[PDB]
Design a protein around this ligand. Structure first.
Ligand SMILES: CC(C)C[C@H](NC(=O)[C@@H](O)[C@H](N)Cc1ccccc1)C(=O)O
Ligand SMILES: CC(C)C[C@H](NC(=O)[C@@H](O)[C@H](N)Cc1ccccc1)C(=O)O
Ligand SMILES: [Zn+2]
Ligand SMILES: [Zn+2]
Ligand SMILES: [Zn+2]
Ligand SMILES: [Zn+2]
Ligand SMILES: [Zn+2]
Ligand SMILES: [Zn+2]
Ligand SMILES: [Zn+2]
Ligand SMILES: [Zn+2]
Ligand SMILES: [Zn+2]
Ligand SMILES: [Zn+2]
Ligand SMILES: [Zn+2]
Ligand SMILES: [Zn+2]
Lengths: 412, 412
């Protein structure tokens, strides 16, 4: 049965899809994401699918044109968090630890700027905890090497301006504050705006066509079609879109007893928005009948590592059983592990068995301008398509699903 | 053609549905709403429909067990706004007008309680505007006669405790503050909680069955199946559920060229939550093909007035044209007007022509324990079902839709 998939997975199709998509970054809600949506829809229609396009609005952020941070009179290197409010505040700097509700209750922040150490709780909550105490701005300092870029997750008027700074620069400020120094800081953020944008999911469904053998089961194969600002997104996640399209073309050649939904999600990089909107469209019957959701994200880089399957809870489920079974016949041992950070989290949240397929450890080009077509491996793309497609077809081929026992290891 | 609908609308069916549903209030997310969902689903299945149940979560509120308001030492009559945070604050009372961002920028609120006059902006925004300035609680006073009950709309940690008081009691406090008095108040709200609840929409679809005459058009007929706390909800909105079910039974007897979706929405009284969740499930193709959405809310009270159609923008649209055309053949002149406040607002927001059918002015029993079966008129229910069903069938019967010109008046 695996031969029905492996003789048909065309790695030139997949590379051509990445080449098309990665001519420019596809930031969610932008004209280039809309172009991708149209392209994706056309490809599915070309394989014979009826396609639906689900729109959704979300709050986008335009990054501030000025980010001025000063300690006294010395200017410092500052990165505005995404969704940071504007500010122009000069005031006393107060160290409040990790910024928990505990950490901030005891201190006087009204009118002041909070210095807060990265860790434990969300950037969002650190900002809100300080702002609830009257902080006019928040400086968050790193837990680890290099710059602190990040996000408050979404628009929120409980926030006050929030800027991230190096562990080196913050550790030193925190030391001086602990030592009894009174420090004054300036936090000026200007030109940031929140604006409503519209993104989309592209959904192509193959109804079962096996007559008396047809089951009520559904399998979702997903990827996301947006990329981060300035990243061409060839691997993150044109690769997964390309495997999603290619497997829909392959399955169009075959009888199936299981409904397959091939989906590309919008606004993944914004916090899984499009898969949360698609999961919220499902009825209770659809949720109970969905036997697995396969998420393909970063599945073509020559510079990443071996394939792994990640689940939200680090437990095995039907999708990791099918991925391990297909790999054992095609490639070898396929490990699993625990990780979120992609659209499988939206389906796990409904109780649906779900896993992310990704090459790990990831390449250095992730979320950079160097995430480009010249890092793509056709052989990797083909191997992921053979494994994921054979895992899906193990259930979707006509006849009762059987999974034979197979050990496979958890890897961290 | 109208005779295919008017000979079949069974007012005993509709009254029996209200009698079943209104044995107790159906608060969204509660066991009684779940019972209604099951009942509704069963009835549609009994007419031959395939039914889907769309779940959705939302944040529910448990009302505080203590609401203590004092001006100095005198205790006052206070109503917590829905979604009010808890508090226990004794502090200076400061009049801040209507509570706009203007009204509050100039004053010193930090640690204090804001007195704010109802009007112009949402209760929610008045609370957030004051809280952004450091207010520890907000007292909002009425614009008009009687008690001030209301809602901050949804859960929100930007809020601080908010309680509503009479125009009489507030006008007097505002007068004294304007006159230079320094006033101290206490606002104590205790035992309020926000908890995640799950509600549902029930969706029954009749696919077109007219062969070569089939169109691509869709019509939605909606109502909501929840009611407010302590109200049995016979008219608000078991009445509309009963017309929705009855028209689905009627249309099951007839050939149609237009897809009909009969929907009962959950969590309407919480801010249209279920229809917003259902509208968000539609694809762009479904939205473009939906030629009208008919919302039935409060359509059976002996103690309300004549039928009217309300649109969000107070403009005529295809649904008010079809309602006016059917009425002109069945009953007489059917006026339209401008009003929101029901699930048609969720479809208008997508560009879909939508109108609410309701008897106006509404009865005195609205949102009370007296919204009960003994106020229901079978004749009214039958007339709404004849008019709405004939309006829908004017498009859904086989053959090209034709609407003949008809004047009908705007009424305020
Ligand atoms: C919640 C998401 C928006 C989180 C965001 N996700 C992404 O960037 C996804 O495109 C990444 N493909 C997720 C990822 C990266 C590296 C290893 C495993 C998983 C991330 O920061 O990783
Ligand atoms: C946004 C909604 C939750 C608003 C809420 N809506 C409701 O109570 C609906 O059940 C009412 N049926 C709406 C209504 C009442 C009177 C006249 C016209 C329309 C309301 O307060 O009217
Ligand atoms: Zn291969
Ligand atoms: Zn191949
Ligand atoms: Zn669009
Ligand atoms: Zn990705
Ligand atoms: Zn990414
Ligand atoms: Zn090789
Ligand atoms: Zn009649
Ligand atoms: Zn009748
Ligand atoms: Zn449920
Ligand atoms: Zn209602
Ligand atoms: Zn109501
Ligand atoms: Zn009569």
């Amino acid at each position: 049965a695996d031969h029905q998939i492996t003789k048909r997975t065309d790695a030139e199709n997949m590379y051509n899809t990445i080449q098309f998509l990665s001519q420019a970054p596809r930031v969610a809600g932008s004209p280039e994401e809309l172009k991708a949506v149209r392209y994706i829809e056309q490809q599915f229609k070309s394989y014979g699918y009826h396609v639906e396009v689900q729109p959704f609005q979300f709050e986008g952020y335009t990054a501030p044109s000025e980010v001025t941070l000063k300690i006294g009179t010395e200017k410092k290197e500052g990165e505005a968090f995404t969704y940071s409010p504007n500010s122009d505040v000069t005031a006393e700097l107060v160290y409040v630890g990790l910024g928990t509700t505990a950490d901030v209750a005891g201190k006087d922040l009204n009118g002041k700027i909070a210095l807060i150490q990265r860790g434990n709780i969300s950037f969002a909550d650190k900002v809100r905890n300080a702002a609830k105490q009257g902080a006019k701005a928040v400086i968050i300092y790193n837990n680890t090497d290099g710059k602190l870029n990040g996000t408050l997750g979404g628009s929120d008027a409980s926030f006050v301006a929030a800027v991230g700074i190096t562990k080196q620069e913050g550790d030193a400020l925190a030391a001086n504050l602990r030592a009894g120094e009174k420090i004054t800081a300036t936090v000026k953020v200007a030109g940031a705006e929140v604006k409503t944008l519209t993104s989309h999911n592209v959904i192509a469904t193959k109804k079962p066509d096996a007559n008396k053998k047809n089951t009520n089961d559904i399998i979702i194969i997903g990827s996301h079609h947006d990329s981060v600002e300035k990243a061409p997104g060839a691997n993150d996640d044109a690769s997964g879109v390309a495997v999603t399209l290619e497997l829909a073309r392959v399955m169009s050649k075959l009888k199936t007893d299981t409904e397959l939904r091939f989906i590309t999600f919008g606004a993944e990089e914004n916090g899984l928005i499009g898969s949360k909107k698609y999961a919220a469209s499902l009825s209770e019957d659809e949720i109970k009948r969905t036997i697995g959701m396969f998420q393909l994200d970063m599945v073509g880089s020559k510079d990443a590592g071996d394939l792994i399957m990640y689940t939200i809870d680090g437990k095995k489920n039907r999708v990791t059983d099918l991925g391990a079974a297909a790999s054992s016949r095609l490639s070898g041992v396929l490990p699993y592990g625990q990780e979120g950070r992609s659209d499988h989290e939206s389906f796990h949240a409904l109780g649906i068995p779900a896993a992310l397929f990704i090459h790990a450890p990831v390449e250095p080009w992730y979320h950079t301008p160097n995430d480009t077509l010249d890092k793509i491996s056709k052989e990797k793309l083909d191997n992921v398509a053979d494994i994921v497609g054979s895992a899906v077809y193990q259930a979707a081929r006509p006849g009762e699903l059987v999974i034979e026992p197979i050990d496979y290891p958890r890897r961290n």
